[PDB]
Symmetry: D3
Subunit: 257 residues, 6 copies
């Protein structure tokens, strides 16, 4: 039986919400350049894949993912000047999250996990949540609860980190098109990665400020912020198990049966 809301009938969905402890999950991604070696829908594919596996384990349901996210920023995604990257304005993304929460609440759902896969989305997701909860409070509804997370933050264990990051962990911001995402894609969707096309460059660095209009010269030419040369299917399987396990555990604590 599918864990995807889109693949259920309305009667099946209605029955699941009627159970009374139904957890819904919404992947939030982007269409964004991910270097010479990888396709552009990574930020949708990855959180969706993690949601699917988590949902199988905890008996949750997964909503259709948000395919377009906030403008790529130089220090976390290369920058929005790249071809292919197709970004929403903040108000549009916020409004989309807001509308979806409104509707889930109308259905009777009261438990939502927003799983972000594109670094830049976070604060617009937060605003969408706040505006939706504000509206629910207008109608006397205070029992809608949201958990929001970026899936990579669950990769915390010192031992796990040492495997993908031999010379050190430099941050989730510069994991754009690098070892983390490329490894996951080798594990899940190998036909969409070509590791021989990786342009091996040093981890991108930046001064402690930002400049607009964005200057293309300050992003590595391929659009990646770190090299995925050492990425592997094995690394991807490790990340996947650690994420799925950690997120399933967190969701059970926040949304117990």
């Amino acid at each position: 039986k599918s864990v995807f809301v889109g693949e259920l009938t309305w009667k099946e969905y209605e029955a699941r919400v009627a159970a009374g402890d139904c957890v819904l999950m919404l992947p939030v991604g982007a269409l964004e350049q991910h270097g010479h070696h990888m396709c552009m829908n990574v930020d949708v594919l990855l959180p969706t894949a993690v949601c699917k596996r988590v949902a199988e384990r905890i008996g949750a349901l997964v909503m259709p993912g948000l395919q377009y996210g906030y403008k790529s920023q130089q220090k976390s995604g290369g920058g929005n000047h790249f071809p292919g990257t197709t970004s929403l304005d903040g108000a549009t993304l916020t409004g989309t999250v807001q509308d979806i929460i409104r509707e889930l609440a109308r259905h009777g759902a009261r438990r939502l996990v927003l799983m972000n896969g594109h670094y830049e989305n976070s604060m617009f997701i937060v605003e969408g949540i706040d505006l939706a909860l504000r509206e629910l409070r207008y109608a006397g509804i205070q029992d809608f609860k949201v958990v929001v997370l970026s899936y990579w933050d669950f990769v915390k264990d010192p031992a796990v980190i040492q495997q993908l990051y031999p010379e050190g962990f430099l941050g989730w911001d510069i994991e754009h098109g690098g070892v983390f995402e490329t490894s996951l894609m080798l594990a899940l969707y190998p036909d969409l990665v070509d590791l021989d096309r990786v342009v091996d460059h040093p981890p991108a660095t930046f001064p402690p400020y930002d400049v607009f209009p964005v200057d293309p010269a300050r992003t590595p030419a391929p659009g990646t912020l770190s090299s995925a040369k050492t990425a592997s299917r094995e690394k991807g399987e490790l990340i996947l198990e650690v994420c799925v396990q950690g997120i399933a555990d967190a969701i059970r604590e926040e949304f117990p049966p």
Copy 2:
């Protein structure tokens, strides 16, 4: 090679747009109840599948689809009071279309086909197009051209109509969860249809006005506006060929090499 932009690298996408006559296609759907016998992501699946086949034929590319559409209306989708149906506000959908066109224009793209799969979306797509073209004009850009269509409108041939609907054509508005959509789904995604669960009610009728708040008693209980009892894979293949050929021809005419 994939016809989906999301499955391309940014370099591959850039090269396709650089050729100068590149046609992009954007499916616009919904998450919406489709009766007891069918799943809720039909309005995304169907135009996406048509886009894919058209794109293969004419050498176009397909953008990630809009998964959430405008509020279901009683006379064309059963109504937004149903569980599962998850709808955007008009401003949100319009803004999403507007943002995407802005970004495609930034890439250098100048040819877009919006393929609607949810009846209620049309006017909000139209407004998104207008607002986007207005903004392009502010930059002296007047060579961006948009074709918008709902894929069912290409099924016009009287002989084909009789083959699909022996008892008579009942209008595309009450083809919600009926013979047309169900037949297409039987041909493309048979596991998401269970024809044994079809409730075989007479076609929905309404007076020449609408009432809000939506009154659930005026929609057939299953949520369908007509019966899919006579739906079949064969009808689906006929529809699919008529739509793909007709749309392929139309796009070749409007966007010639």
Copy 3:
């Protein structure tokens, strides 16, 4: 005693709402080209005249009409590229409807009929209604009821259609500046019609898609979508009687005294 809210004192209006069953009616029109032979305020004049007569029969009141409507579309109104046509953005029209409903509800009114006279307004009226009912629900109010209708939909009886169209009906979309509107204008405001200036072209036809920017060649040069050559005062008188009776009956059904 006047049926127009604008022609009442606030005390007279207050007393009518205090009866507890008062029906208010809001004409929603446009300023739009209507060919060489007719003036541009038709879409206001016609629903206002119908509202007046319905209100006289059923004891309703009529609000000041919306004078500007949504952008003219090629297939229904000739297109927004014509001179004279003066159109609102979707958000503006939606917001206007939303504000008016808020205010009527504040007065204690709970029964509203929106009578549309311009084809393109419909979905923005729908959104304005939804947003207003949403806000009322925030205040625990769910007894405000809205009927929305386009007045031409009440010309439906086969006997009536045959009498008005002895050569055949051809649809409401291409009844822009054709026999229907022109006949009504000949009956109500003959000084605003010059039938000698009618250009007698064949009915407009279009492919099953739309193109933006609009291509002006696909609209008949005069701006009409069908010929009003056979329009008459008598046809207009029949349309008027049928519309008024039908709408009066519908409103009594939905809003019994």
Copy 4:
């Protein structure tokens, strides 16, 4: 021939704009309580009547009027708590003005007089103008010129002020439903005034601050801010000529042939 754009064909309008110096005029009103003795559409009727007469004199055209205006304020209009008064949000009024200027500019018009008839509208009209002119500049259009006025400000001659206000002029703010508007209505629309119903209270006074929520006790009970007991048709004809002459002269100065 008519001076109202709504009563012209699009060809007649196009020809008038093509002449090169065409002045358009837009009345901006309200639906608002005006005491026990006058109807609620005064703020539309009066500037529309003044526009008509000015247009006849100077060869201008008059657009359909804005029927709904900004929220009535206690110190100028009695307050928005009154029945009947039906007010827009600021953003709605601003957007309406903005949309209309955009469209007039599209037609090729470059001269607009906005004639305000409701005190509270002014700053939202100003913002609408500013936003519209900002957008026009984005397209390299800097030759659209707008004159905005409230018609009563043209009553400046001390001899006229004394005829209306022999005990002294107290300001246009408390001139709500008093001698000025009532006199004009007695001259123009006598059937919409019943002077026997005037409540002859002392002129409304307020402290140098404003309180929200609006306190109904601080407005004179009938909703008028001053008594119309001394209003007369003769005074109305005087006001009408003074306004029409003064506005015609101002428009000739600002928009010379």
Copy 5:
């Protein structure tokens, strides 16, 4: 102890609101040209200084002031074409006021004085208040009360006006950079005024209409609307005492223990 909320800890603020009759005051200013002789933050400095003194006297607290206000208008502030003047759009100002009231209500505050220092702000403050009170009404809250005032309106007393203006008071609209503001600044912030730089022109006069785009020729070249040649510290101390006493008394009347 400080009367400024910004200079309190959250515990100190919490305790003051917990008392039950706490009055908060919000200065609303502008960054705007004020002639050759005076700095551009006058409209913040002055209401803030008055707020401080009133708050000391009545035991109120003062919120951080709004530093940026609505677009300067020719007849009241010289016009928004001047350098230095940095103005918000109406929606931005309205939204700021709205957000602050929402948050103060969340804290449990129920008494707010908005003290305006920039003529043009008034209607956007009014709209922000209305939108905030609207949202509070959704939650059943009707005990949040707002007093709004422009501080100069409290200089009313005929005797006071004679001392400040022996040769005649000429209205608050042209008191932009003139005797009133300049005198206050000489009393409070003498280093920010250089009276030798005053350009002594006649009081600004305008016709009874406005023109956009703003024509710079119709504003006195220095940007002032009246001459501050006779401004003095003595006049400033009189104004200050009159304003502080008057406003203190008004706030005690409206927000008593």
Copy 6:
């Protein structure tokens, strides 16, 4: 002469912009709880003080600061559920930044430094900049340049961190009301800090997700995310010297004479 734009006349400001290389600086803060020991306007005071000193060194000017910022988040500011914290919606803050940039560009300014003092503001500042630059491009203006920075990012040097934190640096997110801000306040505004009121709790830790509505138990009771027990004036003096030097150097690099 003052480095604050508010303290200049419009002529002085105009002259500085006319020089051709004028750098403007805009502090962007918040009104936010900062523990038991410190006042709530810290996030305005601190970046304003740094801006003042930088401006004095490099010959720049400082605009009036944004006093209200985005909603406090649990992991960086304790959460928006605290009293005193007074937060804007995202759209409001974005619009404020957008409006100010528009206006500065109108003055002829082309170089802006946005100095953020409140962690949560960052993405809304980014969106405001993008929308403003988008509008400038509509007018052919592409030479407006913006540098955005949070002043604490310039305390980077290992030797400086070692001196300030002999026990260990634990990150900027939990430097809310801790050693960093409190030390700066002891150096700049000692009367607004009372170190005896510091609650000396262990550093705040959180799971790798966020929950809404915020659970107040996850924030330390005082609202601080780390203890300021060891804060000192001397630490503050060093932070100030390091920040001012680093930022002055960065601005000269990006905006050379």
